[PDB]
Amino acid sequence: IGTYQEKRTWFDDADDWLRQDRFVFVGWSGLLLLPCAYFAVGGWLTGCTFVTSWYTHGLASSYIEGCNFLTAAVSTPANSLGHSLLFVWGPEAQGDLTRWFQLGGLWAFVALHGAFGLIGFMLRQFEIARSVNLRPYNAIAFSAPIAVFVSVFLIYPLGQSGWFFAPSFGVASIFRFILFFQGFHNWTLNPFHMMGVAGVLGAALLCAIHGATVENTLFEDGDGANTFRAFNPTQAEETYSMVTANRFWSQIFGVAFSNKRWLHFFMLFVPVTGLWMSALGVVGLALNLRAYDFVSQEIRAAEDPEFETFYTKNILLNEGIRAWMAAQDQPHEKLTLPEEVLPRGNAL
Amino acid sequence: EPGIVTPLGTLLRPLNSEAGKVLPGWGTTVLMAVAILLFAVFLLIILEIYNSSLILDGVTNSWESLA
Amino acid sequence: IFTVRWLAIHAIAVPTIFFLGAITAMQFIQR
């Protein structure tokens, strides 16, 4: 390296073997990503199939009990376990695998291996971009899913009472987590979540608009009715009319893109910024620092029996979510609340 | 082109007088990796002590520890 | 063969077929 003799060691041979074109690229990052990701997906598929949740949550979340794909899940450990890492060799399981499954240790297994798999995957993105000599904008974009995963599956339960309040790996489990954030945190009212929603919706809009515009400015490039075969990667000309696209969107929307650089950087920028803002919001929620209330509105409605808004309706709905969900949601709290103290409307 | 010659600058000049100097081969990278592995093990020990996943005889890991 | 392609393909394929047989067996389990 740098015009030097550089007598070869084991590292040169290992690097030469790892950095080779194959059916699947391995690289140095494959020493972490491949085992961690394989173990995460295998543990999730195993927990959704055989591992029960009857001990920790008091519910059935596996295929061996009668749950669907949208229903079975790898459930979090019990709240009394706290933020225990829940190793097999740890003081909880004590080297017993069939009770480690019953204690919710598979959730910690899948979560830690998924985090290290995400680390290894974005390292793999770095390594492949360095091998092909391209800028790692894919890794920069993938930094936002990693941030969302870290803030949601790690930072929020570490801020809360324990891993029990983390999202269980599933579908109905994630729906429970979402409704819990609605009822207990007022997560829709959070401006960071609003920014994240705007980012995702704008990114989907950008994807649809860019695809439709390119497919509708495709030039002739052939004689057949199928334009897909009119494309040639060898030619050095652009496959679509940027001038026509710019004039169309300038006369339709008022504004249009004039630079492909700026267009694709915006397509990169919008979802990453949205997901990072949502990650910051979930970090704020990790310590129950929630944008739950509007003080002026609540004082106005406290001194006025007439003043009602949709926000007051949402607050009333959140109260019902909390009251009617806590008793069967948190078995550690032992909330044996009678039905009369639970709030009701009229006749329902 | 001649830089500002300075008393304190020529005092501290040797400490910046060998930029780019390197050792041939891998150097002390093996000892560096050994130290990094020991650091990772130590970080795991303190992480599990603070997580109460590593119970010790003298460590209570609670507010009574300063009693 | 037993190359990287073989190992990855079979590490995906074998447990999926085992789990699919397990799930097809669980379809006929009744309380």
């Binding site: 290992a14 391995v26 020493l31 060799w89 740890g90 004590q94 | 010790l56 005889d57 | 190359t3």
Partner: peptide, 30 residues
């Protein structure tokens, strides 16, 4: 003394070293 959790953690360190050595052997092979 040596607590059982500490003994299990040292065994876990040995097991992790064994796993890393096995991964290194697998990638030096093939």
């Amino acid at each position: 003394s040596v607590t059982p959790s500490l003994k299990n953690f040292l065994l876990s360190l040995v097991a992790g070293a064994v796993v890393l050595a096995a991964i290194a052997g697998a990638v030096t092979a093939v």
